Amino acid sequence: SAAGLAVVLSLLASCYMFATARRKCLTPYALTPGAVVPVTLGVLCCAPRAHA
Amino acid sequence: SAAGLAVVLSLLASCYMFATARRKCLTPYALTPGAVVPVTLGVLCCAPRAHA
């Protein structure tokens, strides 16, 4: 069961490090009154579906 | 022990030739009042972390 628990404490860590790298790469694009650079729309799932 | 000394006089030489090539490639960028061209920030570990 410890191996059944070392999965969930090692599959959340690799999911935590994508949400952080998703955040830090597009946080200035949400602060300005500007666009999203639609290449990064394709690669990163951005919250501006097209809005804000 | 001579082979134990011909390592350190052949692992410092290949480290000396990176510090020289790090120096000569970005020495004008430190003299001018200018930026660092952030591609070379990625490849070369530049002392302007972003400053000067």
Binding site: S10, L11, F18, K24, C25 | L41, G42, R49
Partner: peptide, 29 residues
């Protein structure tokens, strides 16, 4: 067991391999 701990053992070092590269770029700019 090596197949289980080699998949998400190899997923995790790729998740660090992004975040080392992203903080190398968007600290610089």
């Amino acid at each position: 067991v090596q197949r289980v701990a080699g998949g998400l053992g190899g997923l995790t070092l790729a998740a660090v391999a992004v975040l080392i590269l992203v903080t190398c770029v968007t600290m610089r700019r």
